[PDB]
């Protein structure tokens, strides 16, 4: 998981150095908060904020008022326990097991 973040933004640091070949760069491997095109675009913000706004109307209704926690690890189901701790996309279920230990 940490070798897809390291090799994504190390090639484009080797690509700044060739295109505008005025300035070298060593930056850190960090979270590039929004890329360049998600930063300032009100067409991408406004349809994304109205996806979270009707995910809350499910969780504010008086019908789905019986539900597990968002950060919950399963223990009974043997299939979902292997499917939570092996997918290299989320990595918030392999940080709980390190904190618990």
């Amino acid at each position: 998981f940490y070798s897809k973040i390291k090799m994504n933004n190390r090639t484009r640091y080797s690509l700044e150095e060739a295109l505008n070949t005025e300035y070298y760069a060593n930056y850190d491997v960090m979270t590039p908060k929004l890329p360049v095109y998600m930063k300032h675009s009100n067409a991408m913000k406004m349809d994304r904020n109205e996806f979270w706004a009707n995910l809350q109307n499910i969780k504010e209704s008086d019908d789905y008022t019986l539900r597990p926690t968002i950060m919950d690890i399963s223990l009974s189901n043997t299939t979902c326990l292997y499917k939570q701790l092996t997918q290299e996309d989320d990595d918030y279920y392999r940080k709980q097991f390190i904190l618990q230990l």
Binding site: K33, M38, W52, Q56, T69, M71, Y92, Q96, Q100
Partner: protein, 80 residues
């Protein structure tokens, strides 16, 4: 036994009394500082905190200590 099981409040004051309940509180605060959307869903993160420390009987003094302790590593970018 009179003032342990009739008068003592049933809350958990340390990080070992609930390793499961305090492990999901830290990982929810690690997640909240990696959202692009952080001002539109403030009140969606409080209502998941109150459901975490009601289900597992976490303390209310030690919980405010963990919130101020994790949020001091991310104070340079997210302080709003």
């Amino acid at each position: 036994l009179l003032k342990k099981s009739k008068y003592e409040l049933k809350k958990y004051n340390l990080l070992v009394e609930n390793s499961v309940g305090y492990g999901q509180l830290v990982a929810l605060l690690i997640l909240a500082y990696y959202d692009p959307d952080n001002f539109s869903k403030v009140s969606a993160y409080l209502k998941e905190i109150y459901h975490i420390m009601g289900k597992y009987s976490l303390d209310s003094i030690r919980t405010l200590d963990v919130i101020l302790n994790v949020s001091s590593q991310f104070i340079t970018e997210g302080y709003k």
